[PDB]
RNA sequence: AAUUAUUAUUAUAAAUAUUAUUUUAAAAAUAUAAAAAU
């Protein structure tokens, strides 16, 4: 009897005569509530022994007492938010005030030098985008400062857009204010608080996108495409005229092939296929509106749809060297494309999907469909899978509910 | 096509497959297919046809396979795996080690028993069998199984009757042949020219485990090199015959045979003189072996301006006059070379020269000659990416502007902490060269102040930058902490330049470029510290030959005494025999040498190699290996997959049935790395596909 | 037990192969050229393609 | 084997013609030379040894019937494994096994404690039952000694 | 990290890092005699002890360590020192008006006076090295620092601050004299010198602004 | 702090606790920092009678 | 019965509800349990 100590959280054996316990299922150890007695503290409410008492206070001072604003303060606060045209004309000036001071990436041979740190401008940049709602990965603006071709184009595309924001006003703002201003009404939604809707992509709204691709140009130079795809396709809310719309629709599809998404590479290219031809087809931009909407199919393995778009690009646009080579690039896979044409053989090509299945993909011995099926955002243990009545699943033994015999079986209702 | 051999003459009785490939078409296969499974079916396919091939082809294929070997270390070290059945590990020699042990087993039958006439005819063949039999270290088969020199295996040496090491038991490959080759040198050589009498004398030294050559073997050629001389009368002056002495004197230095007469002539006859006109002193120059060696002088001819072989050779002779006698012949050789305006003779004479100065007792006279001859300049011109720095390190004044270099009694650079005074001048920073290469090169003696402010100084060794550069590269980064450092030597540079071009495999020579790109372009940026020849002479102990294996250590034994605050690390491979300078590299035992040898101010810095303390104060951190990611073993043989090559699998597929999914035809067990097709096998009743790349 | 085990003796368990062949082993794998996830050779997906042909 | 505490650098190659000399005594002098005790620089840590070549073993001597009444006894692990073997019974098997056993009695005497010192001095003696021995090139100098 | 900052860091362990007498003294105890007379302070019985103590800062013998030696770090570091120990409210009343701030703010002006004399004395040896590869964008704030510390810009530090400040001054005018005839820095990626006009003009502007000050 | 401390011309040092130590026992400890050289902690054995 | 544990807690009433918890791809001893005869 009584080999260890006398506390209930002791280590060795005990006896119920000498040291009579109260049967405490699971209590907290001497070093704090582990993650097992907290599975109750957030579901049961209190520790499962019942003896401990649920001091839920400092959470109440975390959520509620923080989120309390009386009625006579609620309606007035929004009248006190900042003028994000300012933290757009102030941060962009500060963001530059650091982007100028970031070291030129070293160039010593024998070993790749390490890119400059990013804590310098992470704080102002956090302000720029947070008002724009287009979140940029610091790597884009950390490899850009590193690349010898982009360290200057990027920084100066900021100095110039900063110019075309401290000269004009934040035009994607007024677009939201002119809603509250047009459709004749004496209410403009403030005096527009952005200077001193039927416009096209304004000056800034073009230079805004300008540095976004120049942001997304550092992404490709580091080859992180599916974050670049969130940079380009986010600027897609900034073009309202179909000239630049097709340009930025060419950028997104010029970043979806690498990113691995070969379906959306068509759509982003098919819009480049309906907005491109307005200019003289002699420049290398004329042909580009169609190639992506047909290269994305030479990448999607359906060569017969691709065999027609490169045909439709021949008629309109006279000679696009890229579109010309795809005409013959489709003659090397013949017949190995058309003879060997199965409807399902899709040999996954790039890394953007090789990487996106290392994450977000099913695993083995965990995260598979045999561990915890999720159903309506709620995790269900593998048994309770409403998408199968296979063995193990509790649906095998539901019954018939005293209602109609709906089964012909004998031992298996 | 499946052609190339023909079945034995009498078919239904013997089915053995002959051979009919041309030696070229074996070498082409040997080369275009360097994989082990093709490089085995070439050695074996050749050793079967070793009795037909001509004395010239025997010269070629032997001389050819050496391209796969390397004088440095383990000969047949083509291991398969290090099995870990028990606690410690043991090593398993691959099919390619058993292929040369098989090849050498077919040379010791053709040349010893069934054709003893084959090797006397062509003299250049024996002079190639010998050198081959040295590269394959057949006097020491244990290293064909040994991976870490510190961990010597006895796999090929020691067997136990319980049944361990039976099949790879006591190995005697050429010990039959290697000892018939000497029965051919004693008692013939009439058809041997002096270029081969030397090489044969160089074979029996190299092949021996330590270079001793069983002197009756050697002495049978020296007895024959005098008869080649007596017909000229020991007045030889062919300038190429004056080279075969500088080689005959480098040998008989590795062997250690001490014959003054060859030095009594190669030097010029200065000894046997300075032995005339004595008032009262010794007669050291003679050391007469007159009945054994012939009186020899060269002539009134050149008698001066020797070659590199001679200077690295006279290093071993401990005689005081011979060095001052050979210190002008280095000036003249550095005069004639400079005036001739040749690069190769200008570097060769220096890297073979420092070995001479590193032996004189007067370190001052050794340091004087090192700056009057721009040693820190001409040496570094050679090293691949060093030409940039050699320029800057040769700035017009501060190449070596007579630094304080205050040596005390005993020769030890007791300038430490009294050269830390520097004469108070701060060893200036940025100088000139507007392109902002303006940061001055960091010679040690000029920058000994920095190493004091350093937190942990690093030493580089030519191994740590071999097999990968991912360990130096990290230290290249930490250089810009200000607290750290990095010290490379002009020896470690040179000893990297060798393995930069003279490397067994391109995967290794490519490194020593990328391993010298950084250090030559981290020195020009004023981050690392180059210990130049002028300072390797400063730190080394006078009289001891301190190569890069000891410059890594005498530096860590200098600064672990003359600046004890800072750490010291050693970028090297755990396989270097210099990871333990106590076990290897220790000096002759002596009663006076203590364990306090390291810190005592009166002892030479290499006296501390007789202690485990020097290894204790010098750390040896593996800074950072490449990642531990496994290589693609999906293409190698797998004892688990092997059971699936022929496993019936009908009920596995439904629509897309193939003929035999698992079986890669032509390969061994579906292993796309173990390729065998079009290599010579025999299976008269099973198909085989011809060779294609992958 | 007859005594307690010093640490050099609890590590003795980790020398032999029965410990390394149970914990410290890494499996060869590869991306299914279709299923896009890592895989061992032999065990296949559920997709009708990853199941008809056997990558 | 390089392994500091070895010292193969100042070696001298002796030669002890065992002809007519008593086997319990040739095992003594040869031990002072393998253990390197004849050296004025002898420190027990260093195994500074000098190779001995004890040729002509089969001509050894054993005073009296000590060829018939001296056992080389060794008790193995198997129960009932105790082995007794005379000298005239081990001399049937291998004459060098009786000299290598009488050396083991002398090297052990001062070096039983550590395995590295028990066995390493034993590998320095080359027991040859007759004249022939492959060490002509090691110049075995005939050590002078009077029992 | 024992000894604190070998070369780089400001922090150290002197007279406020005590001697703990109750613990198993870690290393350097070569001999067992080192319990009653450890005799540290002796340089060899100290490198044994000092090395194995609190990590001689190395991040982990292969982990990434910081690049503090370079002008691209020290000088934008010194920017934050005086931009904190002397907020602009002191800079305005000093730069604009000559009137006395107050005793308090005059202490905060001298509290940070001898705070520059610290980060200088610690990180001066580093400043001279990366002066070679230092860039003009960073060689241009070296005078713009000693203003917010309110010190007239023009071994011991004074000998070495002079020669360095003279050394940088030329390298600034060289570059500024290298700008008037500026070669093509990028004929590609930015062959049009935009933002380079104003930013390098304001440099030449703000360079001579401090000259009359200094 | 109760400790006398001497700084030798090679960077080395030494301390000598003088807590509760009388004046005569401080001078004695004073004279013992000037004496030694603080260079080697050698055990006076028969092997280390001669340092060189 | 310390329990969500060896358990139909049954004073009474009863008779065709499939009325809703039991992992594992090896070998021995043991443990339950098992065709043929003095």
Short mmCIF file of N, CA and C in Angstrom, two decimals, chain B residues 461-519:
data_model
loop_
_atom_site.label_atom_id
_atom_site.label_comp_id
_atom_site.label_asym_id
_atom_site.label_seq_id
_atom_site.Cartn_x
_atom_site.Cartn_y
_atom_site.Cartn_z
N UNK B 461 41.09 23.43 -44.63
CA UNK B 461 41.89 22.32 -45.11
C UNK B 461 41.29 21.81 -46.41
N UNK B 462 42.16 21.41 -47.33
CA UNK B 462 41.75 21.05 -48.69
C UNK B 462 40.69 19.96 -48.74
N UNK B 463 40.46 19.24 -47.64
CA UNK B 463 39.46 18.18 -47.66
C UNK B 463 38.06 18.73 -47.42
N UNK B 464 37.92 19.62 -46.43
CA UNK B 464 36.62 20.17 -46.12
C UNK B 464 35.93 20.82 -47.30
N UNK B 465 36.69 21.24 -48.30
CA UNK B 465 36.13 21.79 -49.53
C UNK B 465 36.12 20.78 -50.66
N UNK B 466 36.44 19.52 -50.36
CA UNK B 466 36.25 18.43 -51.30
C UNK B 466 35.06 17.58 -50.86
N UNK B 467 34.47 16.89 -51.83
CA UNK B 467 33.26 16.09 -51.70
C UNK B 467 32.03 16.99 -51.57
N UNK B 468 32.26 18.28 -51.33
CA UNK B 468 31.24 19.33 -51.34
C UNK B 468 31.86 20.65 -50.92
N UNK B 469 31.18 21.76 -51.21
CA UNK B 469 31.59 23.08 -50.75
C UNK B 469 30.55 23.68 -49.81
N UNK B 470 29.54 22.91 -49.43
CA UNK B 470 28.43 23.36 -48.61
C UNK B 470 28.83 23.60 -47.16
N UNK B 471 30.07 23.29 -46.78
CA UNK B 471 30.56 23.55 -45.43
C UNK B 471 31.41 24.81 -45.35
N UNK B 472 32.27 25.04 -46.33
CA UNK B 472 32.95 26.33 -46.42
C UNK B 472 31.95 27.45 -46.64
N UNK B 473 31.01 27.24 -47.56
CA UNK B 473 30.05 28.27 -47.94
C UNK B 473 29.41 28.89 -46.71
N UNK B 474 29.06 28.07 -45.72
CA UNK B 474 28.48 28.61 -44.50
C UNK B 474 29.44 29.55 -43.80
N UNK B 475 30.70 29.14 -43.67
CA UNK B 475 31.69 29.99 -43.02
C UNK B 475 31.95 31.24 -43.85
N UNK B 476 31.80 31.15 -45.17
CA UNK B 476 31.84 32.35 -45.99
C UNK B 476 30.80 33.36 -45.52
N UNK B 477 29.61 32.88 -45.15
CA UNK B 477 28.58 33.78 -44.62
C UNK B 477 29.01 34.37 -43.29
N UNK B 478 29.30 33.52 -42.31
CA UNK B 478 29.64 33.99 -40.97
C UNK B 478 30.84 34.93 -40.95
N UNK B 479 31.55 35.08 -42.06
CA UNK B 479 32.66 36.03 -42.10
C UNK B 479 32.20 37.44 -41.78
N UNK B 480 30.99 37.80 -42.18
CA UNK B 480 30.49 39.15 -41.99
C UNK B 480 29.76 39.33 -40.66
N UNK B 481 30.13 38.56 -39.65
CA UNK B 481 29.72 38.87 -38.29
C UNK B 481 30.69 39.81 -37.60
N UNK B 482 31.89 39.98 -38.16
CA UNK B 482 32.90 40.79 -37.53
C UNK B 482 33.61 40.04 -36.43
N UNK B 483 32.86 39.21 -35.71
CA UNK B 483 33.42 38.43 -34.62
C UNK B 483 34.22 37.24 -35.11
N UNK B 484 33.87 36.66 -36.25
CA UNK B 484 34.50 35.45 -36.72
C UNK B 484 35.71 35.79 -37.59
N UNK B 485 36.22 34.80 -38.30
CA UNK B 485 37.37 34.97 -39.17
C UNK B 485 37.46 33.74 -40.07
N UNK B 486 38.55 33.64 -40.82
CA UNK B 486 38.85 32.47 -41.63
C UNK B 486 40.28 32.59 -42.14
N UNK B 487 41.09 31.56 -41.94
CA UNK B 487 42.49 31.60 -42.33
C UNK B 487 42.75 30.48 -43.31
N UNK B 488 43.12 30.85 -44.53
CA UNK B 488 43.62 29.91 -45.52
C UNK B 488 45.10 30.18 -45.70
N UNK B 489 45.84 29.15 -46.09
CA UNK B 489 47.27 29.26 -46.27
C UNK B 489 47.62 29.21 -47.75
N UNK B 490 48.79 29.77 -48.10
CA UNK B 490 49.30 29.58 -49.45
C UNK B 490 49.60 28.13 -49.73
N UNK B 491 49.72 27.30 -48.69
CA UNK B 491 49.85 25.86 -48.89
C UNK B 491 48.50 25.23 -49.21
N UNK B 492 47.48 25.56 -48.42
CA UNK B 492 46.15 25.02 -48.69
C UNK B 492 45.64 25.46 -50.05
N UNK B 493 46.04 26.64 -50.51
CA UNK B 493 45.67 27.05 -51.85
C UNK B 493 46.32 26.15 -52.89
N UNK B 494 47.65 26.03 -52.83
CA UNK B 494 48.36 25.17 -53.76
C UNK B 494 47.84 23.75 -53.71
N UNK B 495 47.67 23.20 -52.51
CA UNK B 495 47.15 21.84 -52.36
C UNK B 495 45.69 21.71 -52.75
N UNK B 496 45.01 22.82 -53.03
CA UNK B 496 43.71 22.78 -53.68
C UNK B 496 43.86 22.83 -55.19
N UNK B 497 44.89 23.52 -55.68
CA UNK B 497 45.11 23.63 -57.11
C UNK B 497 45.47 22.30 -57.73
N UNK B 498 46.13 21.42 -56.97
CA UNK B 498 46.40 20.07 -57.45
C UNK B 498 45.10 19.32 -57.72
N UNK B 499 44.29 19.14 -56.69
CA UNK B 499 42.99 18.50 -56.83
C UNK B 499 42.01 19.34 -57.62
N UNK B 500 42.42 20.51 -58.13
CA UNK B 500 41.55 21.32 -58.97
C UNK B 500 41.61 20.88 -60.42
N UNK B 501 42.74 20.34 -60.85
CA UNK B 501 42.91 19.81 -62.19
C UNK B 501 43.28 18.34 -62.21
N UNK B 502 44.02 17.88 -61.21
CA UNK B 502 44.46 16.49 -61.14
C UNK B 502 43.53 15.66 -60.27
N UNK B 503 42.25 15.67 -60.62
CA UNK B 503 41.22 15.04 -59.81
C UNK B 503 40.70 13.78 -60.47
N UNK B 504 40.37 12.79 -59.64
CA UNK B 504 39.93 11.50 -60.15
C UNK B 504 38.68 11.64 -61.01
N UNK B 505 37.74 12.46 -60.57
CA UNK B 505 36.47 12.62 -61.27
C UNK B 505 36.13 14.09 -61.38
N UNK B 506 35.45 14.44 -62.48
CA UNK B 506 35.07 15.82 -62.71
C UNK B 506 34.15 16.34 -61.61
N UNK B 507 33.34 15.46 -61.03
CA UNK B 507 32.47 15.87 -59.93
C UNK B 507 33.27 16.36 -58.74
N UNK B 508 34.58 16.08 -58.71
CA UNK B 508 35.47 16.55 -57.66
C UNK B 508 36.31 17.75 -58.09
N UNK B 509 36.81 17.75 -59.32
CA UNK B 509 37.55 18.91 -59.81
C UNK B 509 36.63 20.12 -59.95
N UNK B 510 35.37 19.90 -60.32
CA UNK B 510 34.43 21.00 -60.40
C UNK B 510 34.26 21.68 -59.05
N UNK B 511 34.39 20.92 -57.96
CA UNK B 511 34.28 21.51 -56.63
C UNK B 511 35.47 22.41 -56.34
N UNK B 512 36.68 21.87 -56.42
CA UNK B 512 37.88 22.64 -56.12
C UNK B 512 37.99 23.91 -56.95
N UNK B 513 37.23 24.04 -58.04
CA UNK B 513 37.04 25.35 -58.65
C UNK B 513 36.07 26.18 -57.82
N UNK B 514 34.84 25.69 -57.66
CA UNK B 514 33.88 26.37 -56.80
C UNK B 514 34.37 26.45 -55.37
N UNK B 515 35.31 25.59 -54.98
CA UNK B 515 35.94 25.71 -53.68
C UNK B 515 37.07 26.72 -53.67
N UNK B 516 37.62 27.05 -54.83
CA UNK B 516 38.61 28.11 -54.93
C UNK B 516 38.05 29.40 -55.49
N UNK B 517 36.89 29.35 -56.15
CA UNK B 517 36.20 30.59 -56.50
C UNK B 517 35.94 31.43 -55.27
N UNK B 518 35.37 30.82 -54.23
CA UNK B 518 35.00 31.56 -53.04
C UNK B 518 36.23 32.11 -52.34
N UNK B 519 37.15 31.22 -51.97
CA UNK B 519 38.28 31.63 -51.14
C UNK B 519 39.18 32.63 -51.87
#
